[PDB]
């Protein structure tokens, strides 16, 4: 009529979470309604997407990084320091590489990232091919052979006391030429739009994602490890355009990564993420 329990003793380590940072498992949580089975639809007519939230959809999304003005005084085989602080060079890699300083002193840092860079700041290591859209803005007259060449590894740069930037002297047509360097010689007669696709190659499998974060004179290390190399534009010919029109043109370089992948979320940033909140007044602090 009523037996005993021919069972064993079930060990138990009181541990509520056993997973609160990982992305699958019985949550032991509670929903505030009758049925825990309140599961919604497959996003039909909910908003216009195929799939939005696919890194290939965001790292496959393009974003400008910096414009470069090329006047017909800039000399052959010398990069373009006009239009940005990066001399015309562009450290290839998903992590960010640009930052300025906002002051009262306080001297906080500020960035200018793209999605391809907006993600990696959320993780630790990375691996991905990149895709740079190079668009020249000009007429059918502004003509000139423009060379784009890759160089793997660290860069001749200037380790500023608070910020970081390049070195233009080490890039002349003699020091680091582009014959023994992957090359592309874009003509500007009529073929302008370009989309360079750089696979990922480096001695180490992945790469950090601090880039220029906490970078300055001394602590430039992770930066030198967080970028497989760099592209560097260098004119083959002085911009050929009559005074009838502008003696300078502009270049735009987008950015988006394909075949991307990442490893761990806890980023290597000295501190956590504190997105910049444009303050009340230009002087007001953060």
């Amino acid at each position: 009529s009523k037996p005993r329990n021919q069972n064993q003793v079930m060990p138990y380590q009181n541990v509520p979470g056993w997973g609160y940072s990982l992305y699958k498992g019985i949550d032991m949580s509670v929903p505030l309604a009758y049925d825990p089975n309140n599961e919604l639809g497959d996003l039909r007519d909910v908003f216009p997407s195929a799939v939005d939230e696919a890194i290939g959809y965001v790292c496959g999304n393009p974003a400008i990084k910096h414009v470069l003005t090329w006047s017909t005084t800039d000399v052959v085989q010398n990069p373009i320091s006009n239009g940005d602080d990066w001399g015309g060079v562009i450290p290839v890699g998903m992590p960010c590489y640009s930052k300025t300083i906002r002051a009262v002193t306080s001297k906080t840092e500020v960035m200018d990232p793209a999605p391809c860079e907006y993600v990696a700041n959320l993780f630790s290591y990375w691996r991905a091919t990149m895709c740079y859209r190079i668009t020249v803005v000009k007429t059918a007259f502004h003509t000139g052979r423009l060379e784009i060449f890759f160089e793997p590894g660290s860069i001749p740069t200037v380790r500023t006391a608070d910020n970081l930037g390049p070195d233009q002297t080490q890039l002349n047509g003699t020091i680091a030429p582009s014959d023994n360097n992957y090359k592309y010689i874009l003509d500007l007669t009529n073929d302008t739009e370009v989309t360079i696709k750089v696979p990922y190659v480096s001695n180490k499998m992945f790469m950090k994602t601090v880039g220029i974060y906490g970078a300055h004179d001394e602590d430039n290390w992770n930066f030198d490890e967080s970028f497989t190399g760099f592209l560097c534009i260098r004119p083959i010919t002085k911009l050929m355009a009559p005074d009838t029109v502008s003696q300078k043109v502009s270049i735009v370089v987008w950015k988006w990564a394909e075949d991307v992948v990442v490893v761990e979320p806890k980023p290597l940033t000295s501190g956590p993420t504190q997105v910049y909140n444009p303050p009340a007044v230009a002087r007001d602090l953060v």
């Binding site: 160089e151 793997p152 590894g153 680091a176 023994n180 360097n181 190659v201 480096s202 001695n203 499998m205």
Partner: protein
């Protein structure tokens, strides 16, 4: 035609060791190592792979290249007279120059040392030998413009000191010769930055 200059040997050092001596060419693997003031006396530490490239005129080849993955080869030739009899041990320990001493091939016993991967070498039977030291790095591939992170140290060590006549009048000496080349080669990336060294 592009690499095989690498896969073409090169002479590093022509060595000689004589009887009766009591120097770095002797003191075969002290049974014990209590102090780092009296470690195991080596013969010629080669901090591979660099020492290979910087010789045999191969550097001029490796110029305008960045990354490398190669397992090195070796060929020891030895020519002594029958009246001599001795034994040596060659061994390679990766990162032996970039790791705490408690683990180095140095500051370590004879047993452990000869337990390190390598080979013995007699002066009468194994007159000449070889070896394949594989790609011991821990990264995608070795860099060349840096040429600073040599990922191995090729330690030579003796077992029995030289042995010859009782008179040992300057003819009881031997002579060595080392040759090296590379296999499993991979040249991948170009550049303009060249290791000047």
């Amino acid at each position: 035609s592009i690499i095989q200059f690498l896969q073409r040997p090169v002479l590093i050092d022509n060595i000689e060791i004589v009887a009766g001596t009591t120097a770095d060419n002797n003191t075969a693997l002290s049974r014990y190592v209590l102090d780092r003031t009296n470690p195991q006396k080596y013969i010629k530490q080669w901090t591979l792979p660099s020492t290979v490239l910087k010789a045999g005129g191969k550097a001029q080849k490796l110029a305008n290249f960045k990354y490398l993955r190669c397992d090195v080869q070796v060929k020891i030739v030895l020519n002594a007279n029958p009246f001599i009899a001795g034994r040596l041990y060659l061994a390679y320990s990766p990162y032996d120059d970039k790791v705490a001493p408690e683990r180095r091939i140095i500051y370590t016993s004879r047993a452990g040392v000869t337990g390190y991967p390598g080979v013995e070498l007699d002066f009468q039977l194994d007159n000449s030998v070889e070896m394949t030291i594989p790609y011991a790095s821990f990264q995608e591939a070795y860099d060349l413009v840096s040429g600073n992170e040599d990922f191995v140290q090729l330690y030579l060590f003796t077992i029995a000191p030289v042995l010859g006549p009782s008179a040992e009048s300057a003819n009881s000496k031997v002579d060595l010769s080392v040759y090296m080349w590379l296999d499993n080669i991979s040249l991948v990336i170009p550049t303009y930055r060249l290791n000047p060294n």
